[PDB]
Structure formats: structure tokens, C-alpha cells
């Protein structure tokens, strides 16, 4: 709404192509190794109706990043 997480999420969805999971190397190609590695580690094992190899659930990153320890 007044944030930019909802926007990033929509952009991520479009980044992967209406997929709740994105390729580890693909996001590493978009985001710098530093952020990409953190994202890869902060992501969760895809989880869905189809096991996507080399791709993990990105929604978990936004969820982990959504929860603040002082908000």
C-alpha cells in the first residue's frame, strides 16, 4: 500500500514470470552477489504442486523481510 514491498513482490512475480519460485542463478543475475546470496539463503525450498529444480520460493524472502524485530 504505502510501502514498496507489495510493489517489489509484483515485480518479482513478473521477474520470474507468474511464478512463486525463481531460479537461484536468475536472481543472482539480477541482484548483486551480496544481495542475491542473502536472498538465496533467506528463501525457502520452493514448495508447491510442482518441484522446480534450481528454483526456490521467493515469497519466503519477502515474508522473512516483512517481519521486523522492532515494529
Amino acid at each position: 500500500d504505502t510501502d514498496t514491498a507489495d510493489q517489489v513482490m509484483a515485480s518479482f512475480k513478473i521477474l520470474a514470470g507468474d511464478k512463486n519460485y525463481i531460479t537461484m542463478d536468475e536472481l543472482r543475475r539480477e541482484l548483486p552477489p551480496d544481495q542475491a546470496e542473502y536472498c538465496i539463503a533467506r528463501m525457502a525450498p520452493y514448495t508447491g504442486p510442482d518441484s522446480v529444480p534450481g528454483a526456490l520460493d521467493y515469497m519466503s524472502f519477502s515474508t522473512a523481510l516483512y517481519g521486523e524485530s522492532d515494529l
Partner: peptide, 23 residues
């Protein structure tokens, strides 16, 4: 595009820092 999406990510991270410094 891919470049715009990444731009938004960086901007969010960027403004997030300032937001936290404020409250």
C-alpha cells in the same frame, strides 16, 4: 523490465534504512 524490478528492490532497501532511522 528486469532492470526496473531490480531498481525497485534497491530503492525499497534504500528507503527502508531511512525509515528505520526515523521510526
Amino acid at each position: 523490465g528486469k532492470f526496473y524490478a531490480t531498481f525497485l528492490i534497491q530503492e525499497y532497501f534504500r528507503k527502508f534504512k531511512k525509515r528505520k532511522e526515523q521510526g
